[PDB]
Design a protein around this ligand. Structure first.
Ligand SMILES: O=[N+]([O-])c1ccccc1
Length: 258
């Protein structure tokens, strides 16, 4: 049982691109799909992501994780205005659309082993919110999990990004995850570490109050990265628990029960 890792690159407009990887144990059968989105400071090789992708591949998934367009732009020497424009939630939604379209058109590596009837999303931090938005707007997403994220987007930390300020202001209803969670009939899981930063914990309580239909799990002693921040020598009890709970939540919802 070898975990294969197949690199790919999706060419977008002009000089932009998405680099990604498919992680899979090749069993000559279609496997449910997990698409992973990294957080605002992440990239596909950051911290626990390679371990996480392999962990789900060992447990029966066809896994996709990838660099958002803004990562390749930065690495390619794009200037600050270009990188800032690519850093909106709106661009995340568009990059996810390119990943999912290429998956659904069987252009990703080993796509004959992807069960595209059974797509789940896993998003970390800021991508937890954008994954909820994407899932709510796309019927073909069957379930979504957010790790230490979920609340509606707002202006990023550090330097002012005006494109982010405009994106947030022109999309207040569209990006309101409390309203989206309340009406989404697909199962949503939010895992939140109890040691995380305290404006985030308050945002998470508003989601649970707004949308008690969904599933909210606390890991009381875990921080924003479940201890798996870069570099990654080994897993942690908080990351293993988040993986277990995420896995259990997905399989619990594969069969339609009533
Ligand atoms: O209250 N909670 O346990 C909770 C609330 C939001 C997200 C995760 C857990």
């Amino acid at each position: 049982a070898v975990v294969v890792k197949k690199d790919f690159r999706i060419d977008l407009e002009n000089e932009l691109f998405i680099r990604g990887e498919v992680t899979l144990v090749e069993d000559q059968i279609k496997k449910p799909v997990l698409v992973i989105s990294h957080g605002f400071r992440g990239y596909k090789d950051w911290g626990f992501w390679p371990y996480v992708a392999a962990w789900f591949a060992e447990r029966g998934f066809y896994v996709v994780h990838f660099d958002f367009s803004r990562v390749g732009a930065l690495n390619s020497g794009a200037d600050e205005a270009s990188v800032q424009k690519l850093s909106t939630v709106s661009r995340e939604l568009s990059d996810l659309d390119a990943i999912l379209s290429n998956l659904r058109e069987h252009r990703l590596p080993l796509a004959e082993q992807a069960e595209t009837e059974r797509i789940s999303l896993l998003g970390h931090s800021r991508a937890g919110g954008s994954n909820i938005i994407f899932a709510a707007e796309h019927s073909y997403i069957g379930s979504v999990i957010a790790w230490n994220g979920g609340p509606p987007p707002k202006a990023a930390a550090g330097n002012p990004n005006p494109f982010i300020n405009d994106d947030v202001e022109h999309n207040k209803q569209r990006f309101d995850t409390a309203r989206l969670l309340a009406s989404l009939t697909a199962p949503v899981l939010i895992i939140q570490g109890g040691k995380d930063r305290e404006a985030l914990l308050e945002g998470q309580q508003l989601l649970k109050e707004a949308a008690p239909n969904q599933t909210y799990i606390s890991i009381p002693d875990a921080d924003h990265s479940f201890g798996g921040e870069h570099p990654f020598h080994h897993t942690t009890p908080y990351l293993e628990e988040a993986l277990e709970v995420t896995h259990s939540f997905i399989t619990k919802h594969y069969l339609e029960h009533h």
